Input
Amino acid sequence: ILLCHKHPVSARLRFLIPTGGGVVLPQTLPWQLELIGEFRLNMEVPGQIMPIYLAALAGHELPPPPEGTRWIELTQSIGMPWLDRELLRRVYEELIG
Amino acid sequence: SQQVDKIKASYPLFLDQDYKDMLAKKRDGFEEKYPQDKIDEVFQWTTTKEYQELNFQREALTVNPAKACQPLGAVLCALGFEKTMPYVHGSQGCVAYFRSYFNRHFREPVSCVSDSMTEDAAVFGGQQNMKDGLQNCKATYKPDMIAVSTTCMAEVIGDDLNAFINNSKKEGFIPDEFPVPFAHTPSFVGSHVTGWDNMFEGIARYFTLKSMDDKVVGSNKKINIVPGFETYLGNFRVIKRMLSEMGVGYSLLSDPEEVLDTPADGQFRMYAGGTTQEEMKDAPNALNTVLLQPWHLEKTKKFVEGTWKHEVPKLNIPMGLDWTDEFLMKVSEISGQPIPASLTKERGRLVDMMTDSHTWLHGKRFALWGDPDFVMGLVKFLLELGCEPVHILCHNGNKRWKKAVDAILAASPYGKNATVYIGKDLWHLRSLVFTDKPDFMIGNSYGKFIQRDTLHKGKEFEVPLIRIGFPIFDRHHLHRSTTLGYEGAMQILTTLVNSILERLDEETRGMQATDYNHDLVR
Amino acid sequence: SQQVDKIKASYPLFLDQDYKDMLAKKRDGFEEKYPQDKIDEVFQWTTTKEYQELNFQREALTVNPAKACQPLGAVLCALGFEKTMPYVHGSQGCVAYFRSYFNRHFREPVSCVSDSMTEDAAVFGGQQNMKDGLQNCKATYKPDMIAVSTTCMAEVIGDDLNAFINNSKKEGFIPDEFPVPFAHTPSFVGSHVTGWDNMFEGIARYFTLKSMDDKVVGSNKKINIVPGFETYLGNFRVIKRMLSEMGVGYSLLSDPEEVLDTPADGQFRMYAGGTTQEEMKDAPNALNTVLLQPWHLEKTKKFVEGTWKHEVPKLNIPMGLDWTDEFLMKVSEISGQPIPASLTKERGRLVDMMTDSHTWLHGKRFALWGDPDFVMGLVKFLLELGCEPVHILCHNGNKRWKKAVDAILAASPYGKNATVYIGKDLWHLRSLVFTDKPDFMIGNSYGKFIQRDTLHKGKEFEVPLIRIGFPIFDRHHLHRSTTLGYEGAMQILTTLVNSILERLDEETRGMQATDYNHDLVR
Amino acid sequence: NKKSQPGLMTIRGCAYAGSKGVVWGPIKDMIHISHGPVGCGQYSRAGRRNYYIGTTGVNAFVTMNFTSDFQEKDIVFGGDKKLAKLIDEVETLFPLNKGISVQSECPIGLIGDDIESVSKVKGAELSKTIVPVRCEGFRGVSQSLGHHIANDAVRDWVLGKRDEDTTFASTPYDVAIIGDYNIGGDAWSSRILLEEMGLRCVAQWSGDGSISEIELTPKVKLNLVHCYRSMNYISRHMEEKYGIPWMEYNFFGPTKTIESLRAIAAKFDESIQKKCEEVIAKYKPEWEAVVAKYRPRLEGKRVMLHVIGAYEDLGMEVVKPDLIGEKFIFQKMGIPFRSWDYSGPYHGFDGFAIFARDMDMTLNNPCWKKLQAPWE
Amino acid sequence: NKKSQPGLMTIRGCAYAGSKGVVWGPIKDMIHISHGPVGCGQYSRAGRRNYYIGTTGVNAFVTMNFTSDFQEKDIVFGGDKKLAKLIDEVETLFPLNKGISVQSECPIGLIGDDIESVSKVKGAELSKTIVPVRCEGFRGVSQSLGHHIANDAVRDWVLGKRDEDTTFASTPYDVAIIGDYNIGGDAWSSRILLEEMGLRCVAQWSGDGSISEIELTPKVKLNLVHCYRSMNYISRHMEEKYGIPWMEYNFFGPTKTIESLRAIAAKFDESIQKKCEEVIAKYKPEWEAVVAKYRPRLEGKRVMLYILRPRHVIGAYEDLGMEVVPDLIGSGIKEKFIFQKMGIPFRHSWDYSGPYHGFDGFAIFARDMDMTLNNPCWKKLQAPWE
Ligand SMILES: C[C@H](CCC(=O)NCCC[N+](C)(C)CC(O)CS(=O)(=O)O)[C@H]1CC[C@H]2[C@@H]3[C@H](O)C[C@@H]4C[C@H](O)CC[C@]4(C)[C@H]3C[C@H](O)[C@]12C
Ligand code: ICS
Ligand code: ICS
Ligand code: CLF
Ligand code: CLF
Ligand SMILES: [Fe+3]
Ligand SMILES: [Fe+3]
Output
């Protein structure tokens, strides 16, 4: 599950990602949350095909992040490995693009 | 309160007593404003020489700059070509600002597109943005050519314009034979005139670099004219008119005067006139290439001399009397066409106007600013008129240009009290016109505030502004004026002498106090 | 006292404390001046409506007229012919005043001679004066033609110009074949435009009346253009340029723009350009004759329709947009030439400027004055701009012209608050602008004093002057402007909108008082 | 609220335009540094007509352009030291400024500059409120993200500066005008009506706004929001933190103005309602005269476009449109077109007269009837 | 003083120009009617820069144009009734005027109009000084006869008004400035020097002149005549009637100014001479600095002048080291643009500058001469390709 919040007015896309590493949730890649049906992505982990969906936090106020998690923007992903940067790009293109 | 018979706009509606009381209550109750005597003391300090010394020690802060960024000049250059869309690869806000700026200066529609680069482009680059933007622009506006510049975003993230355009052509987003010239225009380097130079060099390279084998200098018996960053349509028109009068075949590359002066007849024209692609392709076949504004056409000069093998003449901007004469002589020498009697008569009429107005013009002190070539041409014309430039400011000038202007000033007795400033903004010029008061300022609309500041010191300290340059926002249709050639010299002379006479009339309009000098004949 | 570093002219030298004290001592000791409070009371009374009632009851006194005498217009008309000497049979002081007036307006040499009629001429007549003057003028200035007008002296004593010139030719003072057209120009009839009309009619009768047997209308496929009393060289230039653009063969009779714009090249040119005698002799062969200013060309119209058999079109002055359109359409119909795309584009550009500036031009109130045709053209253009010409003054207008202007105003919603005044002078207009204050006043330099008067009542009562008309003495090179055609309308619109903008900028330059509306973009 | 199609001509601004141009720039007693190259600050200088009262260059700096003027060295090596030196020079040359905002342009966030740390250090050193705004133009799809970032900066650096300060004497009629940028004096025309109603406008920002007014905003009883789109973030934040209710007011046209005045007065006691009735009665003849003068010459005209009510009050249909509310393109097409360009105010009863006069002037100008050449 | 040759571009004016334009027009508190058609009044309106202090249209009327505006009926039937009605209208619309003059244009003396009787009748009725001037332009050969006629009118209608009045407090240092028309403030620059000498300038006309000053002129001890040509008649008449000596003073250039100041002070006691020496010492550094600044730029230049008696302007040109015989030519506006077309630097109206008289005027004169003679525009007459 990839967790993000898009503001209804400014369209500010903030991603709820673990503070340690990666962007996926609830575990490292090997609230009123609404699922985005049109978004689906599959990654071929050893011995299993794993789908990841998009959950959108509804409302106008960004909630404080839980422990071990942080709200980041696409620009803040600079320096992070390519794979989760591309995942964030796919989410951004589906939501903002 | 509004009376339907005499409706008041913001001025002087907010001068009404109720509005004055409400504003005073707002200021006293919640604004926590500094005391009025205190503001007066600080302003008087800002008008002093000590404040000028503190102001000229600035190294990191720029206040009221007198320059723009490169992609604006690139857009202006792109608008000068036939059915050409300016395309600034980068963020949309840049294009919005460019369009608003040129709309306010020209009071005309200004066409320009962006590929709307955003955070995703900040992370991954704008290759997909380039492909989609080129495809959509070609499909929607049907331009014959798309001239591509860059915003600071694409320059900082290191977007390869050539590779992006080549990949767009390869993947079928645009046809391979569709002309897409490009130029890197870093807004942190130079100014808008640098962007104009870069865009023109990119277009010329795109159209001529790979086809120089079949080019012979002088084949078409024409002269290439590169105007540079020019925001006076009258200058394009006067150059074309003078070349036509001389009987000289010419190619005015980047001619935007038609698209910036579209008639209002119930139909909107996105494109109008402009340099054709055939003219660009046939440009190396010209006898020579004359740069109207050489001091911001360095890259264009290098490309023309190193690729077209054109012996570009050492010509100043055709401004004033002597430099227009030199331009006409050089054109005559290159083309072999004698200067006709009509141009001689026009020069004589300009000399007659100078003789008629020299009494009012002589000894007048001017603080001026603008682009390097325009500023140096104005300084040369003022020296020709017997006027005294005192503060010559060019925010986008360099050391070599300053040395050339100093050499020009030293050659005239009227340049003794002249100082040339490069890299200084209009706050520096405000300090200069406070500490060393000139008679008048010559510059764009941004100088009006300076005038206001001078009027705050007192009527005797007020420096009136003369709106010559770019951008002029608070006046209408001044962009149609001419500053080049004898016609431009006459227009500038008339503006200067009539500004002097208007100021004198205002100063002598007081009945029984100063109206003894309110002469009917001046 | 004077400081050599900054030498002061009369202003502000006489503002010095010693000069102020000396002037105060003079006034208090020997001038026996009225007390300042009484002067202020009388001025305030002169600004009132009851003073306007007293002023408009004037029957015998004229204060600050807005017209001149016939021989001035006759001299101007004579200056428009090739190598032609204006020769005013009468007193020398008239010619001196004419030359000084035209020198101050045009800032150019003005050639005109007088036969120096004196008391002996007052007793026995100016026949000997005419003979000697014609002989001396022909010997000294070698003109191709001498055009003879009259001063009030010769008209009052009743000198017969025809008999005098016939006796001069018969007795050998001048060759019998030498062209000496004449016109009676009584200064107590009409105004300077009437003198222009009389001079042109006399020249046309001299060159055409006796040789109409072989004349066929439309033989030369040209259109005669009579400009009338015109003091804008740009008007002649724009008429010629527009007719050349249309491809229309034309004959501009009385073309003085060449002799009034001689170049400064170290040589004095007594004559330059002008209508040739062959053009005048071939005038009846034209397809038609177009009068640019029909309201002071009545005698010329009668001669041209009655002798040349030309069906002179009923055309207004080509001023503004609609009347320029009608002039171009009539020229197209007469000549059979279509209106070219360049003129259509220029008209569209004028419409575009009108659309750009309509927000600042709409609803503005103007008090204007000048010659009848110029005034009615200006009123028509102002109505086309949405402006309100509240006070229309024409000292040399008549009842028929007033009826025509009233009909024009009734055809526009913006003429409801407009009043036409004929036979009124600038003191009447001063009363009008004090009692019914307009936003601006358009007129010659004589309006500046009115502005001064308004500024004496207060800054809020000041009516700024826009200098369009004749004569303009306190500004330089405004005679080169254009008021006819789309180009003239463009120049007028730019002047009006920019005058409004300078007025607004001056009214909003007060820091922390009115500078909230001191907008950069307008 | 999605990304615009690349390669299309759009009027969308950037986050810098939304933050510096709209929200932060009108604050008169503050100095706003366009951090980055010269272009963004130059094109936005005095572009918007956020009217204010002050001595420009001494205690007010709205129409001035403070910029870092980034060069290639600033891009390569960063501009944090340049920002600190610039802040020092600003304090030297403009002592009467009451605060500094640093509005980031596109390169600032791409070269890894930390303007937050510089702002904190310099604000602590100079005892000055320095507000870093991460309003890079490439962020977001329009000016809406600029509004959001500017509102967040206001909340984080300015709004809570008087949270523990109880020295402000409050009245039950305390209101704050939010989201009115005083375009041509719109906020003043609204404030005169509000204060005639017996209310005390403690805060009015951004238009003619002071930093002290922003700091005093959390002390008011009601938040009257003019532009919900740009200031809804701060409105909701104040509602949740300080428990201050907010309502949108519309003073565009006499009918909407009367309705909004009555709705605002309903929040307060009977005396405020009576004062609102007196204000409505006093201003009724003026707007009635405006209608009687201008509606007959504007009745039945079609407008192609909050602002509906004023058009209806002039009897104009709203949707061959006679008017379009991209200006020069429609001007070339020949349809009259109407931030207000060069006029105003249009809000309030005083603004309605100007609005009606301008609509009649533009719609009925003869210039629109001269488009066709008589020979074509 | 002979008749100019007909048809030879004569530069001379008329009698009306010499009377209305020169002598009567500068009188600020009087209203001067250009009696006749509109042209003469229109062309002479504010043509000369006779500077004055006053509220125009209320108590001063110099730059105004009052005319009878003769029509055909006025020529056929006369304009005496029209003149009387015009005088009544002037009284009703300009109540603060302190006198009226009626300057005749050419038709007045030809249609047999009697303006003297109208003037006497209306002046008796209104208790106002009305001066009829028969300055018809055809009279004489130039403006000299106009000066003579205007001087005779002054003598016959204004000068002797206070003959029987002895209430004026007279001092031994009473002088009257005659013939200075205050062109650009020349008379003021002369008067400041004269009064700094301890003298009391009781009268100063026509320039910045009042009718009361003309009436008070017979009370002065000395008559300082600036323009001998125009006011020699009135000076001689005053000498033979009131026994007032008159002398010509030249304040054009520091040398002539010092010589004239000493000559004037020699007509009074030792205190006036001491004050003259003090004034000369005070103004010596200023004109010395002006000379040091401008003489090097103007040394050796040749001048030809055709504008008055000669040697009046020669002194100031020699004070700048400018030889007088060309690098500069001084004439009127009618020849100004002609000699400009020849390309010779050119300088009546003072080219809308001034004053040129006195020490303060010398600085302006030197600056103007340097500006015109050394202007670069004179070096650009030849096209560089020709
Ligand atoms: C009071 C004033 C005259 C004062 C006077 O006589 N000064 C004479 C000047 C001489 N002195 C006294 C000032 C100096 C000396 O002589 C000092 S000494 O006696 O020699 O010691 C009279 C004369 C002209 C009058 C105005 C006009 O009609 C126009 C108008 C008509 C309306 O219906 C009512 C208002 C108006 C404004 C009138 C008001 C007033 O009625 C005026 C100013
Ligand atoms: S701030 Fe907004 S686009 Fe609310 S970015 Fe935009 S000066 Fe518009 S509809 Mo230009 S949300 Fe203001 C606006 Fe409205 S610039 Fe002005 S007119 S009331
Ligand atoms: S009066 Fe004469 S033409 Fe003596 S008519 Fe003329 S203000 Fe001249 S050379 Mo103008 S005899 Fe005065 C004169 Fe000299 S008007 Fe002035 S400058 S010193
Ligand atoms: S989207 Fe907005 S306006 Fe654009 S840059 Fe970015 S913050 Fe600024 Fe700036 S200097 Fe010129 S105009 Fe740009 S290319 Fe850079
Ligand atoms: S010499 Fe002198 S200026 Fe000449 S008329 Fe005679 S008084 Fe007068 Fe007058 S109106 Fe025109 S300008 Fe004459 S023709 Fe008559
Ligand atoms: Fe336009
Ligand atoms: Fe000239």
Residues E 18, 22, 48, 143, 181, 183, 227, 229-230, 307-308, 348 surround ICS (ligand 3) (CB under 6 Å). The beta strands of chain A are 2-6, 13-18, 33-45, 48-57, 69-72.
